[PDB]
Structure formats: structure tokens, C-alpha cells
Amino acid sequence: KLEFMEMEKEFEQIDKSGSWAAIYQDIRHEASDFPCRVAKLPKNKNRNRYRDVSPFDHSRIKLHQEDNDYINASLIKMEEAQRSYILTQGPLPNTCGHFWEMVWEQKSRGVVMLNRVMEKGSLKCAQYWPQKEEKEMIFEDTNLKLTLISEDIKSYYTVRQLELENLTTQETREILHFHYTTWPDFGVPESPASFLNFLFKVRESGSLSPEHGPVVVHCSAGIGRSGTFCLADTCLLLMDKRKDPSSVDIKKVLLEMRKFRMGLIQTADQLRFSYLAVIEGAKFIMGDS
Ligand SMILES: O=P(O)(O)C(F)(F)c1ccc(CC(Cc2ccc(C(F)(F)P(=O)(O)O)cc2)(c2ccc(F)c(F)c2)n2nnc3ccccc32)cc1
């Protein structure tokens, strides 16, 4: 019952002592590390948005086509939580087709975007989806067509329904796009509430359901904001599935997740926000409806 009061006091104790940085730095340095030889092949240089952010070879997503199967994307599969996610970087001008090719092949139903599209700066991301219902997009290289069907703009996020079509088989699928628009690079969401509401909308859509392929999650690099999002979702699932909610160790889960893609969660504030959201979120789910 008051098992949250203990976690909250604990959380408050860490805030009091100002140990978030030390806690975060301790987690970072125990992170596993694995090869990324494919990401580093010369022919894949223009497929990577950032020189130092690469998917591990063991968990990378492979494109089912031609000569090059490479995309900066990693499959994160959390065994106990029974949930998988594909974490990728914000699509580049030359990788938008690869991006949708992946959504198709992996049979993903939803796309979660946590950054903003920016054509200028160092933290970018291309306009990989149509902004106008009347102007659909065709990706020649991967023979796919995308059409914006609907758009519901809220103040903190925007939900969009898209229609993706395999120009070859001519079949089509409905892809749901959940765009959280107010999450700065290396920053935190507007508030725990706004973040939890966003996360709940994604859940409700059934986009995270085992019925479909894993949801595709990305930001600019696909590690800080995406890592934060996935960690909170995963810890919430564990706190529900487990007999004891306080038994969930955020450090353990983040380290576990980091075995699949490097650098998840980029700042100590993002780690603290993550824990703050899991605590409030768990009080909602295992709370009184
Ligand atoms: O929410 P996100 O995921 O979109 C993010 F905002 F957090 C983000 C943005 C940019 C980067 C690449 C970065 C810095 C970087 C490189 C490698 C890692 C690591 F995961 F491998 P780690 O194990 O060291 O923790 C982390 C961070 C960057 C930072 C700031 C910028 F302005 C920029 F353009 C690019 N990056 N990647 N390669 C780089 C080479 C030189 C400098 C920064 C570099 C990483 C994460």
C-alpha cells in the first residue's frame, strides 16, 4: 500500500542529497558494449546521422532487400516485460525509404517520434511523412507510397493516421504516428502528466500489442529521448506484472535495455524524470480508476 511512500521518500532522499548525477554516471559506466562493425562499414557512412551513435551488430534491424540491408535501428526485446521496441535515429534525406521499408517488413503498426523535424542545426531529422493529405509521398528506391489520412493536433503532441502501401503487392496498412512535439534534445518532457498521457494514448491504440510488429521509436539519435520513453514504459509494465512494485530496479532495467542499443537515456535529469514518471504512472494504473 504505502510502498510508494517509501519509493517517494527514497526519490526525495536522492533529490535532497543531489545524487542523481552520481547514480546516472554509475549506470553509464557499467553499460555493456558490443561491436558495430556493420554500422561502421564505409558504404554505410551516409546512413548514419551521427558518427558515434551506432546500433550493435547483434541487435540491428536488417532491411530485407538488395545489396544493402543496413539501417541505424536496433531491436530492444525486454523478456520479462514481454515487450519489444525498435529504436532508430530520425530519418535522413536518403534514408526515408529505408525507414518505411523497415516499418513494413517488421510489420510495425505504430511510430513514436519524440523530436522535431529540423532542416538546420546539428540535431536534425527529415520530413519523412506527408504534412498535407493531398500530397502523398512516394519512395522510389523502396517502392512505397505514404499518405496522410488524418491529423489531430493537441498542445503537447499530435496523433496522425497514415496509409502505407507496398507499390509492388499493392497491399496497404494503417500506420499510427504519435508525435510528442515538446521534448527538447537532452531535455525532459513538459511534465510527467503530459508524458504519461502521451504514453497512455500510444498504449490504448494497441500499437504496442504483440499482435503487430514492434513499435518504432525515434528522436534525433534514437537514444536519449527514445531511451527515456522505452524505459518508463518497460518499468511500468514490470511494476504491474510483479507482485512487489518496489522490487523494480531502474538501474537494472536500463542496463538490461542498454545491451541492445548504446546510450539509452542521455542525462541524469532524463533518468530522474524517468523514475518520476514510473512512480506517478504506477499510482495511476495500480491506483483507483
Ligand atoms: O534524444 P537524442 O537521442 O536524439 C539525443 F538528443 F540525446 C542525442 C542527440 C545527438 C547525439 C549524437 C552526438 C553525442 C553522442 C555521441 C555518442 C553517444 C553514446 F551513446 F555513444 P555514449 O556511449 O557516448 O553515451 C551519446 C551522445 C551529438 C551531440 C551534440 C550535437 F550537437 C550533435 F550534433 C551530435 N554525437 N554523435 N557523434 C558525435 C561526434 C562529435 C560530437 C557529438 C557527437 C546523441 C543523442
UniProtKB/Swiss-Prot annotation:
In alphabetical order, the GO MF annotations are:
cadherin binding; enzyme binding; ephrin receptor binding; insulin receptor binding; non-membrane spanning protein tyrosine phosphatase activity; protein kinase binding; protein phosphatase 2A binding; protein tyrosine phosphatase activity
Task: State whether keyword Endoplasmic reticulum applies.
Answer: yes
Any idea which residues bear N-acetylmethionine here? 5
Principal cellular location given in the protein's record: endoplasmic reticulum
Per the record, membrane topology reads: Peripheral membrane protein
Q: What class of enzyme is it?
A: hydrolase
Record annotation: effect of changing residue 54 to A/D: No phosphorylation
Residues the entry annotates as binding substrate? 185, 219-225, 266
The UniProt entry's GO biological process terms, in alphabetical order, are:
actin cytoskeleton organization; cellular response to angiotensin; cellular response to fibroblast growth factor stimulus; cellular response to hypoxia; cellular response to nerve growth factor stimulus; cellular response to nitric oxide; cellular response to platelet-derived growth factor stimulus; cellular response to unfolded protein
Residues with Phosphoserine modification: 54, 246-247
Q: Which residues form a coiled coil?
A: none
Q: For the cross-link N,N-(cysteine-1,S-diyl)serine (Cys-Ser), what are the residue positions? A: 219-220
Which residues belong to any copy of the Tyrosine-protein phosphatase domain? 7-281
Cysteine sulfenic acid (-SOH) PTM positions: 219
Positions modified as Cysteine sulfinic acid (-SO2H)?
219
User: What PTMs does it carry?
Assistant: Oxidized on Cys-219; the Cys-SOH formed in response to redox signaling reacts with the alpha-amido of the following residue to form a sulfenamide cross-link, triggering a conformational change that inhibits substrate binding and activity. The active site can be restored by reduction.
Catalytic-site annotation from UniProt: 219 (phosphocysteine intermediate)
According to the UniProt entry, which residues carry Phosphotyrosine?
24, 70
Q: Which reaction does it catalyse?
A: O-phospho-L-tyrosyl-[protein] + H2O = L-tyrosyl-[protein] + phosphate
E.C. no: 3.1.3.48
Subunit arrangement? Answer: Interacts with EPHA3 (phosphorylated); dephosphorylates EPHA3 and may regulate its trafficking and function. Interacts with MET. Interacts with NCK1.
Q: Which family does it belong to?
A: Belongs to the protein-tyrosine phosphatase family. Non-receptor class 1 subfamily.
- Protein's recorded name: Tyrosine-protein phosphatase non-receptor type 1
Lineage of the organism: Eukaryota, Metazoa, Chordata, Craniata, Vertebrata
The full protein's residues present here are: 1 to 285 of 435
